[PDB]
Every structure is written in structure tokens, then in C-alpha cells.
Amino acid sequence: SPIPVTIREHAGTWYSTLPDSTVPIYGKTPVAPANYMVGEYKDFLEIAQIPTFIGNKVPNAVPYIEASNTAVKTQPLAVYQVTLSCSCLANTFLAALSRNFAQYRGSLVYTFVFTGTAMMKGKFLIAYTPPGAGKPTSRDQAMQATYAIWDLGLNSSYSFTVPFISPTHFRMVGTDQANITNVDGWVTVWQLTPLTYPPGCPTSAKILTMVSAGKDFSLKMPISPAPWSPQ
Amino acid sequence: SPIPVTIREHAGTWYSTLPDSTVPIYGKTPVAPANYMVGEYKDFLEIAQIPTFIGNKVPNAVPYIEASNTAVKTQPLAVYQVTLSCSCLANTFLAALSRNFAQYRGSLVYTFVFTGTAMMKGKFLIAYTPPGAGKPTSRDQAMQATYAIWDLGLNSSYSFTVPFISPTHFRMVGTDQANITNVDGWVTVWQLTPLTYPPGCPTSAKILTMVSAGKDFSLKMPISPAPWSPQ
Amino acid sequence: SEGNEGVIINNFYSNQYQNSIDLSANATGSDPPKTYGQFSNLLSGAVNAFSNMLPLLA
Amino acid sequence: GVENAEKGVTENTDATADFVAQPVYLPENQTKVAFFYDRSSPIGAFAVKSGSLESGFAPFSNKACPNSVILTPGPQFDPAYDQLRPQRLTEIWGNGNEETSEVFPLKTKQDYSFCLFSPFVYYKCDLEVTLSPHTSGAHGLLVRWCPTGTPTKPTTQVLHEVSSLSEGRTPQVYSAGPGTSNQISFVVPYNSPLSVLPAVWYNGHKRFDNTGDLGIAPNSDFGTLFFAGTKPDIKFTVYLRYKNMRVFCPRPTVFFPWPTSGDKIDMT
Amino acid sequence: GVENAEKGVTENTDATADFVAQPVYLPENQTKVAFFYDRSSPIGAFAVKSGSLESGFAPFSNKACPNSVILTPGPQFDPAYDQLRPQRLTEIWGNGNEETSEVFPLKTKQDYSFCLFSPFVYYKCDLEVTLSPHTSGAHGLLVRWCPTGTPTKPTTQVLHEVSSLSEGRTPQVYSAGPGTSNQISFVVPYNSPLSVLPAVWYNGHKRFDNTGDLGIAPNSDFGTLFFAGTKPDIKFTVYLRYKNMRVFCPRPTVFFPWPTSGDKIDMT
């Protein structure tokens, strides 16, 4: 009547991620009601959608880019690599969230908030260039890829979504080494028309830059990034 | 209430082929959809049926035999031992597949493709001789066993099936030592009539030789052959 | 077919844990669910209709 | 898509809003909070004092490898009182304390991973603990677990020849035999008198005297663990696993240094 | 039966087509692909470095018996950098590298059997791993498994006196006690971002730069394993088992040498 068992070779091992529970030692303990509580979330995707600041001019990072009164088709206002590893994104919640997973999929959202004067006017060309032929070198080449024209007026910001264009269903989150001329392409910001203004107004303005996940965005396989010290 | 168990003597052993699974450490991982994929197979028997090349004139192997303008009843064009170990079959998928199993059963298919001129003509006698009385030494003796006459004409190849004739339900795949005068008999190819031709045409032709499994063919008990190096 | 497993007992770990999860993607894409949970900040008073209104400019 | 971020809320899109595209959603469940923290991570190495199995307990540390541990993912220890009962801290101490020193490995005890990534103000959960001796030879370990806010000075030996850890009706765990697997595992309930726990910081004092020292809310841990054992030379790792985690109010995470290098990072 | 092989397809027969015979079929299931690869085979011997249990990890090999292993049936190692992290290779290295040298035993690490017989271009499967210490005495082994394409430089020790392998929320496995069976077993999921994996060769480069080096498709493995332990003198074998194997597109297998001898082979 005692039951016969066969002991597996792995007898005694401890698995840090075992899909199971252990021995309870202090049962029947009621907790302190926490039912008045608010603000709970349950999925990181629930908040990955909130835009945080992209760092410009690293390592002297500022949360914005500057538009000028000159449109050089040869000069991007910004060039971001589309990699959740860009030093550019290093401190966005998107990047901080993403660094705990192995792969991502879906839309990335670059939000621009114009902060100049109400009296200023201007147009920007924001483009996404998939990899393969290198980064575009003039607005004329960028304009050949996915892009949008942002006109300044009553409405303050512009939300640009870079479409997930990829051979694989998912893309690796982080880079092992550095990713070349690769990565997954580039977001470049250009002036189409120069910032124009009347007399009595500054001749340049700051554009706030943020990033977030699109409704499309997914992350999978939780891991740990290489440990670091903020200092 | 803890349950009493009796530990078996074999406690702690590891079985390389245990019919069971182990501990999962990274659950709930969704995969990358691979539903666009084609070309899948599920049983080796599914492809063992595709003919591959028999090596003639080993170790200076060529994928064919040569027919001449002379019929010597004393001279076979080829003599293959019916053993999945024949150095003759050493590089056919049949043989490469078969070497991972202990026994086989069923039909073997020798396919001949005539590659000579359209202007040539000729007849071959292909025979299968079961063991017991040694290999036949002339077409006259071969003709006493299982054989077929292959006539050259519009249709390019001939598929000869050697019937499974055996005392046991199955036959061993590989040889331990070398198999004598044994093995399971011989496939011999002879000229019945000589290759004939008109003026302006070559006087010999190449016959491509391949082997495959018949619909009958079965293999059982997976093992590993003796390790080798192709070089 | 199946492999080399021939245990009578129901797998102790459930499948989503014992195996990877085969998913299939449809050619034309799929819509994210509408909501990922119930966490949210809310914008109220966004619009109008109702106040000490129409003394208010045209 | 034109938008107005000043409202404090921004409409979410997919490539579909501005271009000719299609949504590309695929389901996954590894981003749920509970699933994410439901895995073990280490908080440090500990030690047992010689002959603690049969005498009065006393705070002590081996190489800044102490004797007792507070169950909390936050920093604790303070290498300067490696011989005093440990305490919760409001900062992490580097490996050395002068220029020429090093940050890793850290001296204090904490769930560095939790610290590095906890985008919430408050949380609630049960704690699964794993004790792992750094030895594959026999190892005896006696553990005393005291709920948060209860007596934590297991100093008086009441029974002749019995560890003072091993006294009372307070939960005690003990593994020690030639056929054990040496490790110990168990899960403790949630005992803070608080409804939910501060995950990073608590902006208030300890007394109404405002004897000003903000940071930690009192009794906001899972209790203290005391160790006694037989291999005073083997150290063991302690790991935490958050069972049924719940978090409230998103907040920022730890700063990541600007690559004064490339336009991307890596690993290490 | 008369036929025309030029069509690229040939009608299959039994003895029944040309002679007075009968079909002789009998059922068997050992030729299904899944069944065939659902058994364990070894990929090589590995080692642990001294005192890795309590310090920073560092690539190292004992006798061309390294420290970490890439989960893949294909060749890897490159005995010339036995002290560098291992890498996947496009060829197998003999035992010696000069005439007078020997092919067996091979120096690189691979599933020689899989290599010898994989008549398919692509495959998908889950991986069951077995670690077997070459000792019947106590043995302590710490393992860190990192999914393919994630951080693989477990070099910084963050916690004083704790192996750097033993850090984070990355899966870690540890067996070490006087009553264990010493072996470790577990199965890992399929983590390549690729839909299906190249089984032999992948005709493309690593970057769009075409910095030409064909052979292996990036992130086409099952991840890396790092080891730390207590018997730095015992080596252990690592075995792979393909769980629910699926293969696509038949292709040729490894060449077998012409018996410049008989009219048959044998064994060895």
C-alpha cells in the first residue's frame, strides 16, 4: 500500500522560474482591506502607450529639437534610429520597459509638440526609411520613403507612426555589440519650408519630442538587461 | 496525510530515450507564426520513395553504366548486391535513411534511364537472383530467376522492382563484418541484344542508375550507424 | 504524428507551459483589442453645452 | 495625425491613421504584471555564525554576509554595521566608498532588478523565499521568520543547549540531513498593517515628532529572517519571488546613462 | 514497368507491377520524423571555472571544455579561442590540425548525429536539455539560460559574494546537495524571432552591408547556457532532445565514403 515511485534524474534541482508554488507556512492570515485603492494597472502595455521624452543632443540631452528659419534639404533636424536601443530613447518608459523583454512587434509613435510662438508658421517633412540602402542624406531621398508633412497652425502637436516593416514577425529588442547601418531604419525630421515670422518674434522655436507604443505594439519573453549604474 | 512512497531501486537514473517529458522553465511563450510555410513532410517513408543515384565503378563513382555494341552472355553490365550496405548504394538517400534503422522489409526499386541517342536500339535482361546457389555467372543462369526484358524505344526509363523474398518477415539493414556470398542475392544487368545504330552515331551509351523504396518498403527501430567522416 | 512520449497521466504542467504556443498570423493583419486593461487618465470638460451661456461671443 | 499633447492625453494609433497600412496585432501574455514579477531574483549572500545551532543568537556578518535579513526588495544593510542588526536604507552602497573604489558588486542587500524596474508607487503581493547554500555537501540551516512589526531580538536563549532562534511558536524552519537537497523554500503571507506598500519612496516620517527622515514607511516589509546552522563557512543566496503582484499608480523608473559613445547600446 | 524519369517524378511500385506477386506491407511508426528526433544525443563536454559560484563569470574552458554553450545542433567552439566566448561555426574541426593529426574526437561542439543525418532545409522544435556530471559524488551546478538574441555577457557581479550568473530575472537553475541525483533536466521553448530555422545552411549574410560571410542566419539558435559550480574538476556532458520536431523541404545528407574495399560496409 505505500506507492512505488521512480525518482527522476533531475531530483533536487531548483528552477528560478518554475511554473509552480511552494510550501505555505503561515496560513489563514487575513489581510488589511485595500479596497479603497485606485490607479491599478495590470499589463505594462496599458501604460507603454503614454509618451515620454526623447533625449536630443546626447549626452547633454534636452527634450526637444530646434526649428530654424532655414530649410537646408541637406540637413535633418533630427535622425533617430528605429531601435529600442537608440541612445536617443534610453530614458523613455518605452525603452525602459522594452529592455526587460527579448522581442517586440508593432507600431512606434513619435510625437512632436510645437512650442514656438503663435505667430510662427512652418512645415516639416517627417520620414521613416526602411533599411537596405542606408540612411537618406537629403530630404529629397527621405521623401522617397514613408513620410508625412506637418503644417503648423492651431493644433500644437503631430503624432507620426512608424509602420512595422519587417521580414520577421518580431524584431529583437536590444543590440548585442552595436547594429551598424542596420537597426531597422531611420526616422528623419526635415524642414520643408522655413519657420517664418513677423517682426517682434523670435526666429527659432523648440519642438518637444516624445515616443510611445502604438495600439499594435507587443513585447515578449521577459529577461533582464545587462545591469547598470545610473552614475 | 503526506503520502507514503516506496522508492524503486533504479532511483536517480537518466534514460536517453524515456517516453516522457521534463520540467518546463519558460512557459506561456508564444511563437512566431510559421503558417506561410510549405514543403513539410512527416514520415521518412514519404521521401524514401524518391530515386537517387547508384554509384558505379567505385571509388571512381559515376551515376551510370555503359551499354556496348556487344552482347557477351558472360559479362554483366552491372551486378549489385541486394543489401542496403552495398558500397554501390552508399550515397543514395535510401541507404543514408536506412542506416539509422535496424531492419527493413519490402520492395527495392532500381530505375534505369537510357541516355544514349534516339537512333540507338537495344534490349537488356535485368534479373534478381535470391541467394542459395551463389551469383549467376551468365545471362543464361540469371534468366532462371526473376527477370525482365527492357526494350529501348520512345519511353526513356525502366523501373525494375526486386521482390522481397525472405524467410524472415524482416531483414537486417546493415552488415556486421561483410556478408560473404550472402547478403540477399543479386541484381544483374545483361545485354540481350547489342546496342545497334546507324552510321553517324556513337557506338555506346550511358544508362543512369537510381534506387528508391517501393510502396511496400518499411524500416523499424531507430539507432545510429557507426560514426564516420566523409573525408 | 507524435514523438516518443507514452505516459497515461495527463501532463502535470498545462500545455501553455509545457509547450511553446503556436500562433497563426493572418495576411491582412489583426486589430488590437480596444483596451489593454482598465487603467486610464481621463479628460473631462473637453467640449461644451451648458454654462452662463450665450452672453459668450459669436 | 494632428494632435494636441497639452491635454495630458494623446490618442493612440497604428500605421493605419496616416498611411495605407494594416494593424499587426498578435497576442501575448508575458507583459502582465503578475507574470512579470512571478519569478525569483536574488537579494544577496548571507552567513550563519559558528555554533549558532546551540546558543544565543547575535547579529553578525561573515563578509558583509550577515545573519538575518529583512524581507523586502529595497536596500538594507549598511556595510558600516555589518555587525549590527541590519536596517532598511534609502540608498544603495557601492562596493567601495572612495573614487578609486568600484560600484559593483554592491555591498548593501536588495533586489537590484526590482529597484532598476518598478514603475509603480504602491504594490501588494505574497513573498516566496528560496535559501540556496553555496555547497553540494551536507548543510544544516535553522530559520526563524518573524512577521513585520513583531519581536525581532531573538537574543535570549531560553532552553539549555537549544538555539535561541528555535524558541516559541514563531515559525521556524529547519533542514539538516545527509539526504536533503540542501535548499529551503516557503511562502509567507502579507503582514504589513499597511493596505498597500510604498515601492520606491514614502514621503513621510516615522513619528509625529517629524524627527525628519523621510523615505520609508514603517512596517512596510514582509518581516525578518534569522539564520543559525552548521556550516559557518558556507554562504547561501536568498531569493525573493512576488506571488500575485498588484501595482498602483505608474511612476518613473531608474535613469539610464547617455551613451557618450554611439546611437545605441547593447549589454554590460 | 516502363517509365520516363525525365518528368522529375516516378510512379512507385511493388513487386506486383511486373511479376506475379503480392504487396507485403506491415505498419510501423518509428519512421515519423517527430519520433525519430525525440531522443537525446550529446553535443560535447563542458566545465565550470573555479569559484564561479561566488564571483564574476568569465569565458573559460578546461580542455576545450568550456564554460557556456550555444543551444544548437550545429558546430560551434573553434578550439583556437577556447578562452573566448564560443561561437557558431560553419565547419567542424578535427581533433588535430595537421596531416599527422586525427579526425576523432572532434574538438568543436555539435550534434554529430543530427549533422550526419538532417535531410531537410528548415525545422522548428522545442529543446529538451540534459546536463550530466561525470561524477557519482556530490556536484553543484548553477545554470543561466538566456533566450537567443538577449544579453549574453553575464560578466558584472552585482551582488557581493553571489555568482554573476545568478543575477536578474533571467532563468537560473541550480542543483547542489548531498541527496541530489546530480543531473539536471529542463525544456526551453522556441525563441528565435525566425519562423523556422535553417537546419544546415543559410545562404545570406549577417548585415545588409553584405560583409560577406554566408552560412548562418542570425538568432537561429535556442539561446546560450552559462555554467558555474563547485566541482571545477568534473566535466559534464550536455545532451539535446528535439521536442515536437517539424521539418520542411527535403535536401541531401552527408556524404559517405566509397568502400575502396568491398561491395558492402559494416560498422566503425
Add this chain to the structure above:
Amino acid sequence: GRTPQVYSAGPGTSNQISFVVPYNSPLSVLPAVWYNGHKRFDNTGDLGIAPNSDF
């Protein structure tokens, strides 16, 4: 290889090994004592044991 291998070795084993193997002779039934025939058709005479009649 993929040939069945079994291994027991640890400080907590019971040292013994147990397992059952199937019946793999290509023969239908096995000679229990004697088999009155040779190994080859050459009749290189040596009676007694029938080939591949073991486990």
C-alpha cells in the same frame, strides 16, 4: 548517437539500474536451446546458434 544510453551517477541514487527492452530479433520466435543450422548458405558448418537470436 541516438542509440539508447542509460546513466545513473549521483550521491543520492540507489545505485541499481532497471529497464525493459522490446523483442528485436528479426526472427519470429527464438531457438531456446539449439538451432540445427549454419550461419551462411556456405554451410561453413558450425551448427547451434541462429543468427540475431538474442535481445
